[PDB]
Design an enzyme around this catalytic site. Structure first.
Site: not given
Ligand SMILES: [Zn+2]
Length: 179
Positions: A151, A93-94, A154, A108
């Site tokens: 990911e 997670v950013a 994403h 997403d």
């Molecule tokens: Zn994402």
């Protein structure tokens, strides 16, 4: 060049970045400029028997903060200290203010499940999304540059022209914007 804005841990999002957002059918919000390209991407897939959905689009600051906090709590519940949990969570997670979900240009994408599997939708997008202006944002072989783990869900809009050149050269956004 507007669709080539870079938002990383090395490049925080400007607090000046206001996005004109529209609401998708599922209530999720995206930038109005990527709407027809996203619609074309899904119509394309559904013509090939692939049924994708938008699991997450735009996110407020607190929304990212919530996602981060729950991710941190998962590690703390598994014997990680506060520092270890946060460090481990930042790879998935950013940090709120470094997520391109706050741009409204990132989505997403998941499978609807009842028509297509997770593998089917991800592999179709892997070889078709660039034709509609979307790139697989975080490749498994570019994790050292993107700073984010694998990911496959994403996807980020950069424009058809940029996405095509990015896909053909096998680079990520960071490498592409590098002279
Ligand atoms: Zn994402």
């Amino acid at each position: 060049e507007w669709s080539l804005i870079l938002v990383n841990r090395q490049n925080p999002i400007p607090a000046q970045y206001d996005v004109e957002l529209e609401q998708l059918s599922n209530g999720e919000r995206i930038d109005i400029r990527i709407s027809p390209y996203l619609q074309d991407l899904f119509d394309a897939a559904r013509a090939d028997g692939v049924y994708p959905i938008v699991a997450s689009g735009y996110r407020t600051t607190e929304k990212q903060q919530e996602i981060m906090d729950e991710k941190v709590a998962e590690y703390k519940a598994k014997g990680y200290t506060s520092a270890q949990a946060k460090a481990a969570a930042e790879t998935w997670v950013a940090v709120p203010g470094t997520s391109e979900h706050q741009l409204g240009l990132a989505v997403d994408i998941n499978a609807d499940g009842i028509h297509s599997t997770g593998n089917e939708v991800y592999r179709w997008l892997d070889e078709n999304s660039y034709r509609f202006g979307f790139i697989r944002r975080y490749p498994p072989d570019k994790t050292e540059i993107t700073g984010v783990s694998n990911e496959p869900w994403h996807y980020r809009y950069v424009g058809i022209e940029a996405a095509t050149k990015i896909y053909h050269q096998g680079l990520c956004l960071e490498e592409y914007l590098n002279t």
